């Protein structure tokens, strides 16, 4: 049958390299017949802050507010904020979640960090216990499509940045695997600003071409060994 | 002399375990005679999103928005938003920057990620050249004071989360070292919600006591080996 894809997109500028990577993914996945949804976080003015406004109603323990405890309960009570609830429906129904973003400080831009913090709540994405291979989003795939300022060479073990896989750990393992996702190999488009027009068009085409057979891919083993070696 | 400290604090609840760690830091560093400032990001409703509103000057290219370029240029003309500008003054003058936060998704809460993204702009925190040991915040000390849900056992090589050092890499190396900070050993207070009240009190006391002698500690070698090696 057909597949559902959610692209969580975090760039301010539609004409950016990120925007182009997002658009070619929509084009290609749409052409295949997939159901495609894009959460364009900056266009949505998506709220990144984890606050008590994320629960509508009386808190369990208002005297000492604990975001995790209160959102866990709100999830069960169906009292989370609308924005969170709407994202959760998209994730729940998705077969594949693609994150499209520029690397900010070896991680996701804060608006996307806020999506992770607020949407992937206890009771929805994981339980304690009920994580990693017992996470609640088991059966789903995730894929990081990241662009960098630094070159591939800088992101090697002997480059000033260390290997690119090193910075993936909190995202792939600590977040996605934790919630039970299987993780498809990352798409890292290095240093588009430095690249020539030809190399840039090539990186966009490579992503589109990869997407043609994305459903045939197997996920990585999201292990310490995969990320760090030895 | 040389004992200005900025605490960048990211917890919603003054009565929280994080709040207590922040407060004992203020108490002890104030007692020493340090100059102490706290940026209480949630109380400030701090903006986490990197947007064009961060520039108060005329955009150089309003047709195609490039956050990096526009903020770099605006920094040099004192044309960044006042919230950023005010944080930059605090960092510029600080001799030590402590980050106090609960671990969210193997990283900082989004509101604190947004402080990093928006405050540490090119021209202020780094330049090219002017990064890693040559970063523009060279000579300053930084320290991560992190609290977790996961237990100490979980954050070992034999545990499900891997060594805690693994998740520090984007923060300590990719952010702090990149901007020229020397990085003091992290303070990780594991699993306060699982600890008894007395055990929590012990963790708070340990931090207060560590701070008595913080100014003469040796920084870590902020290398891949420290983070991922034996
Ligand atoms: C706050 C912050 C923190 C950062 N931290 C890091 C970090 O830790 N590590 C790191 O490596 N980098 C870092 N960077 C840099 C950042 O990752 C890059 O600037 C970003 O990845 C560039 O992607 P972009 O989409 O903005 O590029 P763009 O500047 O939009 O793209 C580059 C060029 O590609 C062109 N283009 C767009 N579409 C196409 C197309 N279809 N075909 C051909 N050309 C096209 C554009 O017009 C442009 O000329 C940071 C940046 C910021 C702002
Ligand atoms: C969105 C999200 C993502 C998360 N991701 C992760 C993750 O990736 N990895 C991970 O390990 N954890 C994760 N967690 C868990 C999170 O790190 C913990 O919930 C957090 O660190 C707990 O710290 P706290 O200050 O909020 O605790 P609190 O709940 O505030 O503290 C516990 C108790 O300490 C009491 N207390 C306060 N002061 C004192 C004192 N002086 N002496 C004794 N007791 C005191 C409080 O009253 C409270 O009852 C995540 C949580 C959320 C919400
Ligand atoms: C000389 C090149 N300059 C000067 C303006 C163009 C700006 C390019 C910017 C986006 N590159 C970067 C911006 C911010 N952080 C980074 C971190 C790493 Cl590791 C590598 C490159 C980065
Ligand atoms: C009131 C219910 N209490 C039990 C004490 C829940 C406390 C458990 C919470 C903090 N644990 C966690 C919450 C959220 N994420 C996590 C990620 C990892 Cl890796 C490990 C533990 C996590
Ligand atoms: Zn994993
Ligand atoms: Zn380092």
From Swiss-Prot, chains A, B:
Binds 1 zinc ion per subunit. The modification Phosphoserine is found at residues 79, 196. GO terms for biological process: quinone catabolic process. Zn(2+) binds at residues 173, 177, 222. GO terms for cellular component: cytosol; extracellular exosome; nucleoplasm. Its main location: cytoplasm. FAD binds at residues 11, 17-20, 103-106, 147-150, 155, 193, 200. It catalyses: 1-(beta-D-ribofuranosyl)-1,4-dihydronicotinamide + a quinone + H(+) = beta-nicotinamide D-riboside + a quinol. Gene3D superfamilies: 3.40.50.360. Substrate binds at residues 126-128. Keywords: Cytoplasm, FAD, Flavoprotein, Metal-binding, Oxidoreductase, Phosphoprotein, Zinc. Its cofactor is Zn(2+); FAD. Inhibited by melatonin, resveratrol and 5-hydroxytryptamine. One of its GO terms (molecular function) is NAD(P)H dehydrogenase (quinone) activity. Its EC number is 1.10.5.1. It is found in: Cytoplasm. Belongs to the NAD(P)H dehydrogenase (quinone) family. Uses dihydronicotinamide riboside (NRH) rather than NAD(P)H as an electron donor. Homodimer. PANTHER family: NAD P H OXIDOREDUCTASE-RELATED, RIBOSYLDIHYDRONICOTINAMIDE DEHYDROGENASE [QUINONE]. The enzyme apparently serves as a quinone reductase in connection with conjugation reactions of hydroquinones involved in detoxification pathways as well as in biosynthetic processes such as the vitamin K-dependent gamma-carboxylation of glutamate residues in prothrombin synthesis. This is Ribosyldihydronicotinamide dehydrogenase [quinone]. It comes from Homo sapiens (Human).
């Amino acid at each position: 049958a057909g597949k559902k894809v959610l692209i969580v997109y975090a760039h301010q500028e539609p004409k950016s390299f990120n925007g182009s990577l997002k658009n070619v993914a929509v084009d290609e996945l749409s052409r295949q017949g997939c159901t495609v949804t894009v959460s364009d976080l900056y266009a949505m003015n998506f709220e990144p802050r984890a606050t008590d406004k994320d629960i509508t109603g009386t808190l369990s323990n208002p005297e000492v507010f604990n975001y995790g405890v209160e959102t866990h309960e709100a999830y069960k009570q169906r009292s989370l904020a609308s924005d969170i609830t709407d994202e959760q429906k998209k994730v729940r129904e998705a077969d594949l979640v693609i994150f499209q973003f520029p690397l900010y400080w070896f991680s996701v831009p804060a608006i996307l960090k806020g999506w992770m913090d607020r949407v992937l709540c206890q009771g929805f994405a994981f339980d304690i216990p009920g994580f990693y291979d017992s996470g609640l989003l088991q059966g789903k795939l995730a894929l990081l499509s990241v662009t960098t300022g630094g070159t591939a060479e800088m992101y090697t073990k002997t480059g000033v940045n260390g290997d690119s896989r090193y910075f993936l750990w909190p995202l792939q393992h600590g977040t996605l695997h934790f919630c039970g996702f299987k993780v498809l190999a990352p798409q890292i488009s290095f240093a588009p600003e430095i690249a020539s027009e030809e190399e840039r068009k090539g990186m966009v085409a490579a992503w589109s071409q990869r997407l043609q057979t994305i459903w045939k891919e197997e996920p990585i083993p999201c292990t310490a060994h995969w990320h760090f070696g030895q």
